[PDB]
Amino acid sequence: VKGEGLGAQITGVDPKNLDDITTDEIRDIVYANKLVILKDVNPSPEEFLKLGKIVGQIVPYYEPMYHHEDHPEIFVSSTEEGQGVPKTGAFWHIDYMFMPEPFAFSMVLPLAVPGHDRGTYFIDLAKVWASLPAAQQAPARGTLSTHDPRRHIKIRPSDVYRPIGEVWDEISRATPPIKWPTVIRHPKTGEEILYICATGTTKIEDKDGNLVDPAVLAELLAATGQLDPEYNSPFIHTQHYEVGDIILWDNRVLMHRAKHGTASGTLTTYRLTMLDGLETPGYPA
Ligand SMILES: CCCCCCC[C@H](CC(=O)O)NCC(=O)O
Ligand SMILES: [Fe+2]
């Protein structure tokens, strides 16, 4: 492990001797540093899958148009016609944050990268929460937030010529809004996390079930730095893609968003998403 914290680089990951990596060792590195780069791995699809199985329980994405043609577990973001889906993740989110079991870990392998300006922005939601005074934290504790993904589900090739209301209705059954505690506690690190997302968090309600003042959700979102279109907030870390360098991170603690670029060429990334078996997203706080 070269550095410490978000950009930490890890050098010994050999795609033909993955049996040397144990689950507890890679998990502890990820929990501690939150975002790590497995440098110069360049795995095949099957070696990637082996590494994913080391990390945790691989969950395939629910929508098969994202699947790798040969490996349903691999979520494919690619500008190649008919390969996965182009330009995914162009908005702040947590992977599967709208689903019954959000992922513990996300893992992205960049396969083709044009230029050197694309990657992912990350925000540490535990550091945001720890930054807030107790009086500001108090309206958020013991509440439930609603996360509505539906407006961000993408039109699929098989949706062409469907009435949009029927596509919407199908989305509403597949990915209905869901409620999570506004503040959660990481089941492993003990860290409290402000689990809110400008893209999908619509409201906060208290233990009675009453609406909390809309000014509370708005203030907290602003505090995360998710509402600055110029990405200058101190809480934003920028991680640039590099071919073969695998990006692996804690999907409970980090909110992220695609960073786009200007260079011509194919952008192709493969993603594996894993549960760790612990309370997800976390314990209520
Ligand atoms: C709660 C915020 C809604 C996020 C919409 C989810 C669509 C994305 C895929 C894509 O960006 O096309 N989901 C990926 C995942 O959750 O792992
Ligand atoms: Fe994502």
Side-chain angles (χ1 to χ4, degrees), residues 93 95 256 271:
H93 61 290
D95 291 335
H256 71 274
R271 177 194 91 171

Side-chain angles (χ1 to χ4, degrees), residues 56-80 82-284:
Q57 170 182 359
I58 306 184
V59 177
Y61 198 63
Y62 82 100
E63 167 53 59
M65 87 162 159
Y66 294 83
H67 292 169
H68 191 288
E69 62 184 352
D70 302 313
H71 302 284
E73 291 159 304
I74 288 175
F75 169 103
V76 173
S77 172
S78 173
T79 55
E80 211 89 76
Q83 246 203 307
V85 175
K87 198 209 259 300
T88 63
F91 46 76
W92 291 108
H93 61 290
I94 278 192
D95 291 335
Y96 258 27
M97 99 167 287
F98 52 95
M99 295 289 272
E101 296 183 293
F103 312 131
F105 308 111
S106 294
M107 182 165 80
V108 175
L109 160 73
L111 282 208
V113 176
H116 299 76
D117 53 352
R118 288 162 173 90
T120 305
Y121 297 116
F122 290 95
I123 283 161
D124 186 335
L125 295 177
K127 298 209 162 182
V128 180
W129 178 248
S131 88
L132 302 183
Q136 184 165 45
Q137 293 178 333
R141 305 195 167 266
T143 64
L144 286 185
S145 293
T146 293
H147 308 290
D148 184 354
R150 287 175 296 159
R151 282 181 47 102
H152 289 271
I153 309 300
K154 281 180 176 66
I155 298 310
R156 308 161 293 185
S158 69
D159 291 324
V160 178
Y161 311 131
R162 298 179 74 200
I164 184 162
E166 292 180 30
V167 180
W168 180 261
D169 288 341
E170 178 175 350
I171 285 164
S172 296
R173 306 287 84 71
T175 57
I178 201 181
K179 296 176 201 281
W180 292 122
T182 306
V183 184
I184 61 174
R185 192 176 62 258
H186 202 295
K188 179 78 180 198
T189 71
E191 264 163 27
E192 289 182 330
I193 299 155
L194 177 55
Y195 202 66
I196 66 173
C197 167
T199 301
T201 302
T202 64
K203 61 179 182 176
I204 297 174
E205 52 213 10
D206 64 19
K207 179 231 164 210
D208 313 305
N210 306 325
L211 184 82
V212 177
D213 182 10
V216 173
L217 173 56
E219 81 151 57
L220 299 163
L221 283 178
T224 65
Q226 282 172 72
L227 299 185
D228 159 26
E230 325 287 15
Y231 312 119
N232 298 131
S233 157
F235 297 109
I236 294 176
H237 166 85
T238 305
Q239 191 67 36
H240 292 93
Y241 289 139
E242 294 134 316
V243 165
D245 284 353
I246 296 174
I247 301 168
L248 170 61
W249 73 93
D250 185 319
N251 184 57
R252 289 173 174 103
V253 70
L254 297 186
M255 179 74 57
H256 71 274
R257 156 178 220 159
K259 179 185 195 265
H260 290 312
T262 64
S264 270
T266 293
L267 173 68
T268 300
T269 75
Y270 293 3
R271 177 194 91 171
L272 285 174
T273 51
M274 280 64 66
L275 313 168
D276 65 3
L278 307 182
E279 194 64 30
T280 174
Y283 301 120

Side-chain angles (χ1 to χ4, degrees), residues 21-31 54-55 188:
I21 299 149
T22 70
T23 302
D24 74 278
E25 276 163 18
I26 204 174
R27 280 195 189 182
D28 284 358
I29 289 171
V30 178
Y31 290 133
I54 309 292
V55 169
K188 179 78 180 198

